[PDB]
Structures are given as structure tokens and as C-alpha cells.
Write an enzyme that holds these catalytic residues in place. Structure first.
Site, PDB file in Angstrom:
ATOM      1  N   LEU A  39      15.209  35.664  64.002  1.00  0.00           N
ATOM      2  CA  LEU A  39      16.663  35.560  64.106  1.00  0.00           C
ATOM      3  C   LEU A  39      17.172  35.656  65.545  1.00  0.00           C
ATOM      4  CD1 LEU A  39      17.514  37.954  61.074  1.00  0.00           C
ATOM      5  CD2 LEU A  39      17.416  35.443  61.056  1.00  0.00           C
ATOM      6  N   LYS A  62      13.880  44.763  63.843  1.00  0.00           N
ATOM      7  CA  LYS A  62      13.840  44.691  65.288  1.00  0.00           C
ATOM      8  C   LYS A  62      12.489  45.202  65.754  1.00  0.00           C
ATOM      9  CE  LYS A  62      17.443  45.694  67.610  1.00  0.00           C
ATOM     10  NZ  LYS A  62      18.500  46.313  68.461  1.00  0.00           N
ATOM     11  N   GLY A 115      26.007  36.798  57.310  1.00  0.00           N
ATOM     12  CA  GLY A 115      27.035  35.942  57.858  1.00  0.00           C
ATOM     13  C   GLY A 115      26.880  35.597  59.312  1.00  0.00           C
ATOM     14  N   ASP A 156      27.971  48.444  74.353  1.00  0.00           N
ATOM     15  CA  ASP A 156      27.565  47.049  74.304  1.00  0.00           C
ATOM     16  C   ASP A 156      28.471  46.222  73.406  1.00  0.00           C
ATOM     17  OD1 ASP A 156      24.422  45.221  73.957  1.00  0.00           O
ATOM     18  OD2 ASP A 156      26.039  44.997  75.422  1.00  0.00           O
ATOM     19  N   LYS A 158      30.549  43.296  72.304  1.00  0.00           N
ATOM     20  CA  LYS A 158      30.667  41.874  72.603  1.00  0.00           C
ATOM     21  C   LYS A 158      30.525  41.129  71.283  1.00  0.00           C
ATOM     22  CE  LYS A 158      25.794  41.480  73.865  1.00  0.00           C
ATOM     23  NZ  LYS A 158      24.919  41.011  74.983  1.00  0.00           N
ATOM     24  N   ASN A 161      27.290  41.023  69.066  1.00  0.00           N
ATOM     25  CA  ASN A 161      26.784  42.234  68.441  1.00  0.00           C
ATOM     26  C   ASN A 161      27.553  42.630  67.193  1.00  0.00           C
ATOM     27  OD1 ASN A 161      24.727  42.502  70.261  1.00  0.00           O
ATOM     28  ND2 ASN A 161      25.683  44.158  71.429  1.00  0.00           N
ATOM     29  N   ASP A 174      23.115  46.526  67.303  1.00  0.00           N
ATOM     30  CA  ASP A 174      22.515  46.647  68.625  1.00  0.00           C
ATOM     31  C   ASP A 174      22.993  47.895  69.346  1.00  0.00           C
ATOM     32  OD1 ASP A 174      21.674  44.430  71.415  1.00  0.00           O
ATOM     33  OD2 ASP A 174      21.096  46.478  70.903  1.00  0.00           O
ATOM     34  N   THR A 191      27.057  44.026  79.187  1.00  0.00           N
ATOM     35  CA  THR A 191      27.071  42.594  79.505  1.00  0.00           C
ATOM     36  C   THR A 191      28.173  42.313  80.519  1.00  0.00           C
ATOM     37  OG1 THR A 191      26.965  40.305  78.649  1.00  0.00           O
ATOM     38  CG2 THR A 191      28.674  41.671  77.750  1.00  0.00           C
TER      39      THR A 191
HETATM   40  O1  LIG Z   1      21.015  46.357  65.247  1.00  0.00           O
HETATM   41  C1  LIG Z   1      20.548  45.244  65.561  1.00  0.00           C
HETATM   42  O2  LIG Z   1      20.119  44.935  66.704  1.00  0.00           O
HETATM   43  C2  LIG Z   1      20.556  44.177  64.496  1.00  0.00           C
HETATM   44  C3  LIG Z   1      20.348  42.841  64.820  1.00  0.00           C
HETATM   45  C4  LIG Z   1      20.414  41.862  63.847  1.00  0.00           C
HETATM   46  C5  LIG Z   1      20.698  42.236  62.542  1.00  0.00           C
HETATM   47  N1  LIG Z   1      20.820  41.189  61.510  1.00  0.00           N
HETATM   48  O3  LIG Z   1      20.446  40.058  61.794  1.00  0.00           O
HETATM   49  O4  LIG Z   1      21.258  41.497  60.394  1.00  0.00           O
HETATM   50  C6  LIG Z   1      20.912  43.548  62.188  1.00  0.00           C
HETATM   51  C7  LIG Z   1      20.837  44.515  63.173  1.00  0.00           C
END
Ligand SMILES: O=C(O)c1ccc([N+](=O)[O-])cc1
Length: 340
Positions: A39, A62, A115, A156, A158, A161, A174, A191
Site C-alpha cells: 500500500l 507496517k 477508503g 505529522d 498532513k 496521514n 502514522d 513535512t
Molecule cells: O499508521 C499507519 O502508518 C498506517 C498506514 C496505513 C494504514 N492503512 O492503509 O490502513 C493504516 C495505518
């Protein structure tokens, strides 16, 4: 300052602290999962859609390469991220479902939010109407009220995220720069377009940087582009520190007024960082139509429901080269990551 909010936040902090002091560890392993699709990818890790082989549930896993985390000076940040995520609980914060490590990697198995990124939706439609931006902004205000009450700074914010869930609500993701901070902290991170002036200027900074970033986010949602845009980071930073912002004429007066108070260069005058704290934001005219409790309870109908077919649908994420998840025969960086 309703006693109801005080007592809610006191319980929230109690529950956080219990998990903070005794973190969970080693709650799954890699061969419990099938890999489906990458992803997203970065300089020291990746996020992959996975499926649990016994339950059938999908998750966003992750994966961080320990050696690269060390090389890029992200050890403490990674430990922060996992310790915080396993301890928080709020309707608009993504849930950490499992974590573990092996000889090569660290793993955080998150809820999957099908989504996709707010960023993708924003760029596809151009800009959000003020009511639409306000719905998302209200969720961030409540989430920051929660996090800041726990002495956590997010650092972070943005559009990339903020993922949109099956009900059209935000999930903040994130936590790679999130940190528990009483007082000040100093690391250069974030960022470029979203950095507060005091970060750029290498000061000891506080939770006010999150409120600045909210101003940037609201501007970008309502305009379609961020307020300090420029071609190169140094040019962005010059605009950020300058104390000047231009607003599109389509912005309402209330929106402009709120944004001048969030995008206040002087952190001692910035909304969210005054004596009345978050209530200067919640009580601002731009939020007059917001039912804060109804947002928290997820009783407001969202601006849109993302289009997706089910919990394994990846159509709102984009395509990346599929690379191995290799696990060395020898343990790497064991000492650095003992607490993970
Ligand atoms: O916390 C994260 O970095 C995170 C990234 C992507 C997804 N996701 O694609 O559902 C969930 C959490």
C-alpha cells in the site's frame, strides 16, 4: 471546561498511563498472515495489506527494517510510535492490533482503512467545501484535544496521514513522529509545508506546532493547495516564517479569521496555545454549526462514503513494486529495539 469533559479526559489519561507503563509486546508473528499488496513504501519501511490466516481479517501491516531505522536515526521515534499506539484509544485514531519483531524487522499490524488517503480524495475533487473541510477539521480538533491532554504531540499532520473509513470519518495514521512531551522538544521532523516557524527556526517547541499544522490542513482542504506553497523547501520555509498568508476570495470571513489565529507565527498568540486552550478553537464562529458530541459519537452523516467493494479492496490505494519481506538468519540491532 464542563466537568463532563474534564472527567472524560481524566479517565482517558488514566487508561493511557496504565498501558504506557506496561506496554504490550510480541502479540503475533509474521506467518500468521498472508501478504496481499503493498500500500505504500518509504526509506526505512513499507505498509502492506495482509490477511490473518485463521480469522480472515484484513490489516495494514507496517514493516520497518531495523538496520535502516538505525541508519536514518529513527530508533527513538520508532519506539515512541509503537509505545504510544499500543496505549491510545480514540474514535479517530487508527488502532494497533498486534506488534512483534524478528531478526530483521519491526511490525505494527494496524486496522486497515479501505477508503484511502484524504489526500487522494482532495486531489481528485480539487477542494472541499467549507462544511466538508469543517467535518474533518472537527475530528482533528477532538483528536488533538485527546492527544495533548495525554502530553502527546502528533507532529505529522498532513492529508496523506488521514485515511477515510467506511463511514466517511477520519482515521489518523502514522505515529512515526508522535512523542510524549512535558514541556518542550527539539527534533526537526514533520513535512515541509506543514512545519511551524518554531520548528524551522530550531527552537524548543510544544503542542502549538500541531495547532499550526491544523491551520495548514484546513487551508489546504478548503483551497486545494497549502498556504505556503513553493517549488523548493527553502522557499517554503521563507514563506512560513514571514508572517504573511494570502487567502482565496472564496474563503468565508470566519474561515480567514480562524486561520489567521492558527497560522500565527508567534506561538504565544496562537489558538490552541492560549489560556483557554482548545476552547478558543471549538468556540470560534467557523465551528458554530459543529455538534462536538455528535461528531465524537459518529452520529453525523459524513460528506461522502469512499467507494470500495469490501475490506480487501485496495482500489483507493496506488501501485508499488512488490518487494520481499526477508528475515535474516542473524538477529540485527537487537539491543536498540529491546523494548519493542
Ligand atoms: O499508521 C499507519 O502508518 C498506517 C498506514 C496505513 C494504514 N492503512 O492503509 O490502513 C493504516 C495505518
Amino acid at each position: 471546561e464542563q466537568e463532563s469533559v474534564k472527567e472524560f479526559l481524566a479517565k482517558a489519561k488514566e487508561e493511557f498511563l496504565k498501558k504506557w507503563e506496561s506496554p504490550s509486546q510480541n502479540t503475533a508473528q509474521l506467518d500468521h498472515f498472508d501478504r496481499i499488496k503493498t500500500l505504500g513504501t518509504g526509506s526505512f519501511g513499507r505498509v502492506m495489506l495482509v490477511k490473518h490466516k485463521e480469522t480472515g481479517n484484513h490489516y495494514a501491516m507496517k514493516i520497518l527494517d531495523k538496520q535502516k531505522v538505525v541508519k536514518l536515526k529513527q530508533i527513538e521515534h520508532t519506539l515512541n510510535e509503537k509505545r504510544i499506539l499500543q496505549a491510545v484509544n480514540f474514535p479517530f485514531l487508527v488502532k494497533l492490533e498486534f506488534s512483534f519483531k524478528d531478526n530483521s524487522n519491526l511490525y505494527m499490524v494496524m486496522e486497515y482503512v479501505p477508503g484511502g488517503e484524504m489526500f487522494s480524495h482532495l486531489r481528485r475533487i480539487g477542494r472541499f467545501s467549507e462544511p466538508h473541510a469543517r467535518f474533518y477539521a472537527a475530528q482533528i480538533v477532538l483528536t488533538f484535544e485527546y492527544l495533548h491532554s495525554l502530553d502527546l504531540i502528533y507532529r505529522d499532520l498532513k492529508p496523506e496521514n488521514l485515511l477515510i473509513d467506511q463511514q466517511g470519518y477520519i482515521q489518523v495514521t502514522d505515529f512515526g513522529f508522535a512523542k510524549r512531551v512535558k514541556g518542550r522538544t527539539w527534533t526537526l521532523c514533520g513535512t515541509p509545508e506543514y512545519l511551524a516557524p518554531e520548528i524551522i527556526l530550531s527552537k524548543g517547541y510544544n503542542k502549538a506546532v500541531d495547532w499550526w499544522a491544523l491551520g495548514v490542513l484546513i487551508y489546504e482542504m478548503a483551497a486545494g493547495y497549502p498556504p505556503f506553497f513553493a517549488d523548493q523547501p527553502i522557499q517554503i520555509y521563507e514563506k512560513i516564517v514571514s508572517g504573511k498568508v494570502r487567502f482565496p476570495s472564496h474563503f468565508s470571513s470566519d474561515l480567514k479569521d480562524l486561520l489567521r489565529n492558527l497560522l500565527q507565527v508567534d506561538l504565544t498568540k496562537r489558538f490552541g496555545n492560549l489560556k483557554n486552550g482548545v476552547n478558543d478553537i471549538k468556540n470560534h464562529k467557523w465551528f458554530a454549526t459543529t455538534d462536538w458530541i455528535a461528531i465524537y459519537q459518529r452520529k453525523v452523516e459524513a460528506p461522502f462514503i469512499p467507494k470500495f467493494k469490501g475490506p480487501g479492496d485496495t482500489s483507493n490505494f496506488d501501485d508499488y513494486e512488490e518487494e520481499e519481506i526477508r528475515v535474516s538468519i542473524n538477529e540485527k540491532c537487537g539491543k536498540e529495539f529491546t523494548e519493542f
